[PDB]
């Protein structure tokens, strides 16, 4: 995804979404259809 695609999908900065749990970057991504 582009970044501004990132924070509207997943409702946070890729700075913030990069200190959740690594398994769960995992889940939040694949539950979207994204990598």
Same mark, same amino acid.
Not at 6 to 22: Q, W
């Given at each position: 995804?582009?970044? #501004?695609?990132?924070?509207?999908?997943?409702?946070?900065?890729?700075?913030?979404?990069?200190?959740?749990?690594?398994?769960?970057?995992?889940?939040?991504?694949? #539950?979207?259809?994204?990598?």
């Amino acid at each position: 995804l582009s970044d #501004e695609d990132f924070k509207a999908v997943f409702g946070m900065t890729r700075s913030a979404f990069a200190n959740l749990p690594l398994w769960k970057q995992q889940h939040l991504k694949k #539950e979207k259809g994204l990598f």
